[PDB]
Design a protein around this ligand. Structure first.
Ligand SMILES: *C(=O)[C@]1([C@@H](O)C(C)C)NC(=O)[C@H](C)[C@@H]1O
Ligand SMILES: *C(=O)[C@]1([C@@H](O)C(C)C)NC(=O)[C@H](C)[C@@H]1O
Ligand SMILES: *C(=O)[C@]1([C@@H](O)C(C)C)NC(=O)[C@H](C)[C@@H]1O
Ligand SMILES: *C(=O)[C@]1([C@@H](O)C(C)C)NC(=O)[C@H](C)[C@@H]1O
Ligand SMILES: [Cl-]
Ligand SMILES: [Cl-]
Ligand SMILES: [Mg+2]
Ligand SMILES: [Mg+2]
Ligand SMILES: [Mg+2]
Ligand SMILES: [Mg+2]
Ligand SMILES: [Mg+2]
Lengths: 196, 222, 233, 204, 195, 212, 226, 195, 196
């Protein structure tokens, strides 16, 4: 699994591969690991597919009910609800989730929630089996306040390398852009990103 | 940990007639839920009017058959081209198998042919060498499906004569080669229906005083 | 007894009217790490045989040296080394099969699955399999690892039995092999896009093709797939 | 250790022309030790017959349970339960013990009283229904029974012919199983008469 | 505990049960009565894990005695055996199952017939002419198969029982310190004090 | 498996069943559990079938070499000890054997040695080995006397196997009888348990529990 | 078990083989693996056979009550959500692996569900021991904008690949077509390429062959009047 | 095998050894002599794992008999016991050790004294007035501690031995089918045929 | 352990960290993992310190005896001797060795020998626990026929990242340059490479 979220000038972009493997068999080569818990709060999923889907579905329910009562929730609030589920059920869960969202007040924010259930607010986050191979690259190449086009290139190049080396990652590179302008989905095929 | 054994499936069947003998076996070769080959010969002509099959783990099965064929060759060299009798072949195979008593050939071996009086003969072995002359023997995966049918239709077990009601048994009349082949084919057709490792093809080797003849029949490929 | 470290995945093969085709990708995996991308797993022996190997790469390199050494040894005191007494596919296979079974019997196996493809002196197609257990079998189509599960079904639609071999041309056979390699790239997590293919024909001889790539891939439909059930955006 | 092969035993069922047949051995054992030669495994609730193999305490328990349930069914419905309906009841009842199951191999047999149609069915320990046209097998010699039935069986057999087929299927299968035998019973079932026959077999 | 036997003859049921109680390396007692009277014409012998045996036997005894008072009526041996089986069948899927095997010998006053029921700890009931639990049957069944007749007298039944005990005393490794024998018939339950 | 052998006035009776089982599966009903070591010695099969066949056939070779070298019949004591010393060398390796080496010589008279894969070697008058041994012992112990006739002794051995064949699930098929004299063993036929059971039930009045 | 699902122009099709097995033994040669959740929502199951039957009946029952409560035809996403949440709760112990397909007022849908509760979306899917053989065929011949006739052909061909090459699958091919604005057609035994050949011999016994001890009439009737 | 006892009195050594041979569920023999004569005035009893016991005993016997012929002289009990200990001490660090415990009773003709040596399978030798192996000592040592005197006669030693056997027959779970008793004195070795 | 060898225009450069750990304790913070088997044939060691030292000592012995008889050995020959030891004793060894050398005929060559005992000739090689984090970076930044200064920078930046993320790697960055000119040792301290 190769997943990442990166903050930039206009907001935040989530990125992910599309491979789902049962051992060495690719069960699904066109998986969507970028999932929506609110209009402009999305998450990247890694670990158990069942666990991360179940968690994400519960979070979406909580934020839908939150919105009905108290209006639009913050990205921090969404991350807290993810944490609460991941921390309190740490013994029975295998979930590594990156939460990313866009407020107008706070702009682009990224929170990573690893296995333990801890929360870490970061400028950008990487996770999944394929992330190990791009710690060096991402650290050397990340800058704060990048443009949309630069951030797309940064994610595309990063996940391209993660896919290249990690057998558990592959397929298409899906991306979701979160800004004031709205929500934009992007897709990049093997023939495009492999030759980078 | 390394596991030196495997299961290649398959099923074999030997039947001894009055003046003939048949040794049949399906031609399917498998591992787990995959088919390796739809036609991989399992019953072999070993010379001296003897036919042999070593069913189970195919590597050990091929090794044993190869060593026995080799034993037949050296028996000719050492003893003035003397014909290896079926009973002598059976004893020789025991020593080949027991030679690896503490790391066995993981196979159920059957040989067939004619004894020194010209009558039909089938011998049956366990993996570690215990052997015995028998009139009827199925071996391998679907052996449990076939043997009861053979007890009933070859040896007329539990069959009595109408009118007497359990008092007089059905007489043990001799079966012709045409009659035996029918029972072999129906045994494998039935086994193919109910056992997943049995199918593809059936190959029968018939042994008479005239020599060794082969017959092949199609089986369901699912 | 050991465990395999650097590994190679599927080897696939089939017979056609005048010869045999064999193929295998150029990847040497290190667990889930796709470590080495330039590994040749098809190793030709003479001009009439190609040995395709999967499994442990260090053991493959050992087998590669044995075959190289076999050619040298056959040439010794042999005026007909490049003619009547040249190495046949059947000779090369039986040698390997002997070694594989001996090594498993000492509880120290060569952790491989091997397919020997070639053409005999009389023009007959040779295609036979052997693995770490010393198990051997022949079939119109043969494949190792994931290939057994995904390639064979596709190749068996072309050559379902022995009588289909004379009806199958080299163009149809090669097409089926190349398509199978694409399917394995879609679905095998330990595979690569780059592969090698070898054709051994009784008329045109040995044609070894390097640096092939999987092409004509379908990915466009991925853009329409969203979420995992209820999600619309 | 394995609950399904402590006590041993077998059941087989077959269809014929306007008739069904169900049969079982009579052995109950404690592994190698033969304990009883009168342990019948076929029961009936009205015109619906149920054979049960496996762990003997559960065989007894389930019989008592289905007697219980079919009796209440009859009082409320004001009619006897049918084979198709009973099959669903057996399936429901077994599956409610999904994670603590009865270690049994049930077999239903009977003729629908209204349509006159012959019916047989089999189940795994957990309730899955196997509704075959030809025959159903169950017990420690199920492999043997599959082999016998598959070769001996032909469709549309008359009651008295069907008796011979199912009897020979059971007897020869039981003789190749250590934990089956010690006598046998065969039920021949027609729309409005049922004949029960005890078979003579080897007692080892 | 170790050996318990049972035999149903013409007009009575005879139960034989060992006297030894062994705890590890020592035989703590050699006069233990492994039986309880459930009702005037129904006797139950038992063998299994220590503690569970007596606890189970007394629990059954109390329940049958309660039924007898409530209805002013004695349950049939068949009825008692079915009750006992259900308790064991209930027990086997409990948190901690009763590890107890029993024989129920009774005389049915309605049918005027002796009845012997063998029930193991799983709740496996069988009605038999003669029965045993554990390794006891392994030695005695061949003798019982040979000599047993359904029309035997009580004296003949005791003689066949002596032959069974002698075979046990010869071929069993464990010293079970002899047996206490009890007879159940139309007149009730009595103990054979010399055996 | 049920095998027995007992000494008496007229020599030795050896009786065995014929069943072979792999788990619950009955592999064979026609197994020969008496090895004819030579015209004067017999051996029984229990536990491992191959181990018995292989090593007691081998024993026959050693006994033949003995009488070629020593110009004299090998004693039952010596023959049994050759086998027990052999299996003792293999102790731990996993041989499975329980056999009665039976013979009748001048110096010893009728002799039975129980030989074991644990290295045990016991001389004795009565022995029963196998999963159905306890059933056979019951009939033997209650009916055995030294002054049995050859006819009654043969029947006792036959009846004792039948007793085990009935109760023991892993014993049955048929009964093989042998009678060992000083001039050699004498085979007393193969007796199907199916037919024998009903014959015995009627003529003897036994097995009243079973319906026939 | 080979089960597949294929999307097409105006709907979705699912297919399955008809072999059920207990170990290496074939229990039923003509097993029905296509299950009805609601009239126009069907699914095919693999794994523990009781679990797939049970879980589809339970959800199917609740779906029916939901449809009556809301006065609306049931949706596939409802069946999907109910199935996954049920399977997740039991942490994989309910061994049901399902391909769920159907048409509803929202449109045509195709999903897969695994025992642990994870779900996937796709245009073509396969599950079971023969899924790799089937997926090989699907990956070789699938395209966008398939017609009804093409999708049935592709689905049944994918099942055949499983039937022939996978030992866990066999016998016949069952199909169910769910098209938008139409009744779902359940094609039981759509293909029958595995009929057993006539036997060489008849094994009908002569009457009186079996030995009998006792005969008796069984009383199946109730207690009689008078 | 099971129970072996030994007692050294004034002018002799007495060894008692059980007669039972049990293999699993059955007592195959009830007249087994668990002893070998090493020399005219030296007797060794033994108990341990099946096969190993007899093999070891006969191996020792052969070696002592060989020494006797070579030197035309009988080794002292002390010398024989030291030889036996070394063989067991050698054995315990072998590929497959002899699992055999022994008692060596002998009469030293030079010193005119009876001698009893107890040696376990590890090669642990002790000279004692009375000894045992396995669980036998657990019952009998309290009686021997109480009654034993160094100046006892052979008849008194046998009476104390009967009291030991009676206690074993009362409190041991296993039926060891009585004991064979043998006396070793200046005149050699003899068996007490009635006990 | 972070180790690498990189071929370039003038020859080849070996690079390595200096950390040796027993669990989480740093047993030696100034270890020399770049070791000499011949004048211009060196190796990088990873895995068991005992095993790799024992192997390297044996190889040095073999190449010293080779030189006495047949003159200077090739880098390929040295790699073959390493392989022979690593392959034939695979059950008892934990050694991941990179062999690097300079001929005049063949110029700079790099052979990597992972756990199995296989041999792989490469333009450059990376190994050790810390290598996982720089597969992406090294693949994106490596070029063939680099200069000495470029290759030193490439190794310095690579191992800097490997050290940053891998707890098992650290200390100083040692390097050894192999060219026609001779053998040059280089060292780079934390204060230098951390700020990169
Ligand atoms: C990624 O974490 C991953 C994906 O299959 C799911 C879809 C998130 N999880 C795994 O367990 C496998 C191995 C993949 O890494
Ligand atoms: C008997 O000992 C027995 C027979 O199968 C062989 C043929 C002697 N051996 C066994 O292992 C099983 C349990 C049989 O009792
Ligand atoms: C298929 O999944 C399968 C079928 O038997 C049932 C009927 C669905 N399930 C199994 O457990 C076996 C092995 C078959 O694959
Ligand atoms: C590197 O591989 C490493 C170093 O300690 C030695 C000096 C090569 N080996 C190890 O086992 C530890 C964990 C280091 O990674
Ligand atoms: Cl997912
Ligand atoms: Cl070091
Ligand atoms: Mg990849
Ligand atoms: Mg089949
Ligand atoms: Mg039987
Ligand atoms: Mg029996
Ligand atoms: Mg019971």
């Amino acid at each position: 699994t190769s997943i990442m979220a990166v903050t930039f000038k206009d907001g935040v972009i989530l990125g992910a591969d599309s491979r789902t493997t049962t051992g060495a068999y690719i069960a699904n080569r066109v998986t969507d690991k970028l999932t929506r818990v609110h209009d402009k709060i999305w998450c990247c999923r890694s670990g158990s597919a069942a666990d991360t889907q179940a968690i994400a579905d519960i979070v979406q329910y909580h934020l839908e009910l939150y919105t009905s009562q108290y209006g639009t929730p913050s990205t921090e609030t969404a991350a807290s609800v993810f944490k609460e589920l991941c921390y309190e059920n740490k013994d029975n869960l295998t979930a590594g989730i990156i939460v990313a969202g866009y407020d107008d007040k706070n702009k682009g924010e990224v929170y990573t929630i690893p296995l333990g259930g801890s929360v870490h607010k970061l400028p950008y986050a990487i996770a999944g089996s394929g992330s190990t191979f791009i710690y060096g690259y991402c650290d050397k190449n990340f800058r704060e306040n990048m443009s949309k086009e630069e951030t797309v290139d940064f994610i595309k190049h990063s996940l391209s390398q993660a896919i290249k080396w990690d057998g558990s990652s592959g397929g298409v590179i899906r991306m979701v852009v979160l800004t004031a302008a709205g929500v934009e989905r992007l897709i990049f095929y093997p023939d495009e990103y492999e030759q980078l | 940990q390394f596991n030196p054994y495997g299961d290649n499936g398959g099923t074999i069947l030997g039947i001894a007639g009055e003046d003939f003998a048949v040794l049949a076996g399906d031609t399917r070769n498998i591992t787990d839920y995959s088919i390796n080959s739809r036609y991989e010969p399992k019953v072999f002509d070993c010379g001296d009017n003897i036919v042999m099959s070593a069913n189970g783990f195919a590597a050990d099965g091929d090794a044993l058959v190869k060593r026995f064929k080799n034993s037949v060759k050296w028996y000719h060299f050492d003893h003035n081209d003397k014909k290896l009798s079926i009973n002598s072949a059976a004893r020789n195979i025991q020593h080949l198998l027991y030679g690896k008593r503490f790391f066995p050939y993981y196979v159920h071996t059957i040989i067939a042919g004619l004894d020194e009086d010209g009558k039909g003969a089938v011998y049956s072995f366990d993996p570690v060498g215990s052997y015995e002359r028998e009139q009827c023997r199925a071996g391998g995966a679907a052996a449990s499906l076939i043997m009861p049918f053979l007890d009933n239709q070859v040896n007329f077990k539990n069959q009595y004569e109408p009118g007497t009601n359990g008092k007089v048994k059905k007489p043990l009349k001799y079966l012709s080669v045409e009659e035996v082949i029918k029972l072999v084919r129906d045994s494998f057709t039935s086994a193919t229906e109910r056992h997943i490792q049995v199918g593809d093809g059936l190959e029968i080797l018939i042994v008479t005083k005239d020599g060794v003849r082969k017959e092949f029949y199609e089986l369901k490929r699912d | 007894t050991q465990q395999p470290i650097v590994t190679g995945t599927s080897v696939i093969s089939m017979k056609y009217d005048n010869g045999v085709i064999i193929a295998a990708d150029n990847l040497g995996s290190y667990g889930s790490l796709l470590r080495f991308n330039g590994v040749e797993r098809l190793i030709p022996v003479g001009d009439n045989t190609v040995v395709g190997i999967s499994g442990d790469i260090s053991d493959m390199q050992h087998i590669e040296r044995l075959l190289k050494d076999l050619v040298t040894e056959n040439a010794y005191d042999n005026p007909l080394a490049d003619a009547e007494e040249a190495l046949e596919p059947s000779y090369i296979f039986e040698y390997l099969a002997t070694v594989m079974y001996q090594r498993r019997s000492k509880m120290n196996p060569l952790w491989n699955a091997i397919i020997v493809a070639g053409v005999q002196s009389n023009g007959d197609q040779f295609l036979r399999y052997v693995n770490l257990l010393g198990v051997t079998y022949s079939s119109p189509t043969l494949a190792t690892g994931f290939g057994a599960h995904m390639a064979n079904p596709l190749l068996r639609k072309v050559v379902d039995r022995e009588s289909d071999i004379p009806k199958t041309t080299v163009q149809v056979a090669e097409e089926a092999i190349v398509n199978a390699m694409r399917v394995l790239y879609y679905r095998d997590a330990r595979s690569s896009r780059n592969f090698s293919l070898a054709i051994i024909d009784k008329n045109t001889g040995l044609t070894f093709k390097k640096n092939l790539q999987v092409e004509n891939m379908k990915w466009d439909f991925a853009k329409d797939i969203k979420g995992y059930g209820t999600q619309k955006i | 250790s394995d609950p399904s092969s402590i006590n041993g035993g077998i059941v087989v069922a077959m269809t014929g022309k306007d008739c069904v047949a169900i049969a079982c051995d009579l052995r109950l054992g404690s592994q190698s030790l033969g304990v009883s030669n009168k342990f019948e495994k076929i029961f009936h609730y009205g015109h619906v017959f149920l054979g049960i193999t496996g762990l003997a305490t559960d065989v007894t328990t389930l019989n008592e349970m289905f007697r219980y349930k079919t009796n209440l069914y009859k009082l409320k419905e004001e009619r006897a339960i049918e084979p198709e309906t009973f099959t669903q009841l057996v399936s429901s009842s077994l599956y409610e013990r999904r994670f603590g199951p009865y270690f049994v191999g049930p077999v239903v047999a009977g003729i629908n009283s209204k349509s006159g149609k012959p019916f047989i069915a089999g189940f795994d320990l957990i309730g899955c229904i196997d509704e075959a046209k030809d025959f159903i097998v169950s017990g420690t010699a199920s492999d043997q029974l599959f082999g016998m039935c598959e070769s001996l069986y032909e469709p549309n057999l008359e009651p008295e012919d069907l008796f011979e087929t199912i009897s020979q299927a059971l007897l020869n299968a039981a003789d190749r199983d250590a934990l089956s035998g010690w006598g046998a019973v065969v039920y021949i079932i027609k729309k409005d008469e049922v004949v029960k026959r005890y078979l003579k077999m080897r007692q080892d | 505990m170790d050996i318990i036997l049972g035999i149903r003859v013409q007009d009575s049921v005879i139960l034989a049960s060992s006297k030894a109680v062994t705890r590890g390396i020592s035989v703590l007692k050699d006069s233990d009565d492994k039986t309880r009277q459930l009702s005037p014409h129904t006797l139950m012998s038992f063998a299994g894990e220590a503690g569970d045996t007596v606890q189970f036997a007394e629990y059954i005894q109390a329940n049958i005695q309660l039924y007898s008072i409530r209805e002013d009526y004695e349950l049939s041996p068949q009825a008692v055996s079915s009750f006992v089986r259900q308790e064991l069948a209930k027990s086997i899927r409990s948190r901690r199952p009763y590890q107890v095997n029993v024989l129920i010998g009774g005389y049915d006053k309605k049918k005027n017939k002796p009845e012997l029921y063998q029930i193991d700890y799983l709740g496996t009931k069988v009605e038999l002419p003669y029965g045993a639990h554990g390794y006891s049957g392994f030695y005695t069944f061949s003798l019982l198969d040979h000599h047993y007749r359904p029309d035997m007298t009580t004296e003949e039944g005791l003689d066949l029982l002596k032959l069974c005990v002698q075979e046990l005393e010869k071929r069993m490794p464990m010293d079970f310190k002899g047996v206490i024998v009890k007879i159940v018939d139309k007149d009730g339950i009595r103990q054979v004090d010399d055996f | 498996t049920t095998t027995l052998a007992f000494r008496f006035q007229g020599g030795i009776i050896v009786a065995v069943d014929s069943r072979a089982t792999a788990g619950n599966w009955v592999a064979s009903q026609t197994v020969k559990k008496v090895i004819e070591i030579n015209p004067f010695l017999l051996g029984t099969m229990a536990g491992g079938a191959a181990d018995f066949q292989f090593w007691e056939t081998w024993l026959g070779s050693q006994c033949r070499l003995h009488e070629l070298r020593e110009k004299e019949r090998i004693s039952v004591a010596a023959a049994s000890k050759i086998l027990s010393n052999l299996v003792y060398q293999y102790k731990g390796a996993g041989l499975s054997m329980g056999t009665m080496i039976c013979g009748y010589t001048r110096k010893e008279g009728p002799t039975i040695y129980y030989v074991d894969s644990d290295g045990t070697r016991l001389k004795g008058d009565i022995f029963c080995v196998g999963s159905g041994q306890t059933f056979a012992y019951g009939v033997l112990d209650s009916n055995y006397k030294w002054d049995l006739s050859v006819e009654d002794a043969l029947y006792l051995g036959k009846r004792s196997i039948l007793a085990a064949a009935h109760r023991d699930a892993y014993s049955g098929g048929s009964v093989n009888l042998y009678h060992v004299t000083e001039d050699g063993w004498i085979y007393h036929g193969n007796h199907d348990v199916g037919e024998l059971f009903w014959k015995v039930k009627e003529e003897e009045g036994s097995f009243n529990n079973v319906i026939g | 078990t080979t089960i597949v699902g294929v999307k097409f122009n105006n709907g979705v099709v699912i297919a399955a083989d008809t072999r059920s097995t207990q170990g290496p033994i074939v229990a039923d040669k003509n097993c029905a693996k296509l299950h009805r959740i609601s009239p126009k929502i069907w699914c095919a199951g693999a794994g523990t056979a009781a679990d797939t039957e049970a879980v589809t009946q339970l959800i199917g029952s609740n779906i029916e009550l939901h449809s009556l409560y809301t006065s609306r035809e049931p949706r596939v996403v409802s069946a999907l959500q109910m199935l996954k949440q049920h399977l997740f709760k039991y942490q994989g112990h309910i061994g049901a692996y399902l391909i769920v397909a159907g048409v509803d007022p929202t449109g045509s849908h195709l999903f897969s569900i695994h025992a642990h509760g994870s779900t996937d979306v796709g245009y073509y899917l396969s599950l079971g021991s023969g899924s790799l053989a089937a997926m090989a065929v699907l990956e070789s011949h699938w395209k966008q904008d398939l017609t009804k006739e093409e999708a049935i052909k592709l689905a049944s061909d994918a099942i055949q690949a499983g039937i022939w090459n996978d030992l866990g699958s066999g016998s016949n091919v069952d199909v169910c077509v769910m098209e938008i604005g139409k009744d779902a057609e359940y094609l039981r035994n759509y293909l029958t390429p595995n009929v057993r050949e006539e036997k060489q011999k008849s094994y009908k016994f002569p009457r009186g062959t079996t030995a009998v001890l006792k005969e008796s009439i069984v009383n199946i009737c109730d207690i009689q009047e008078e």
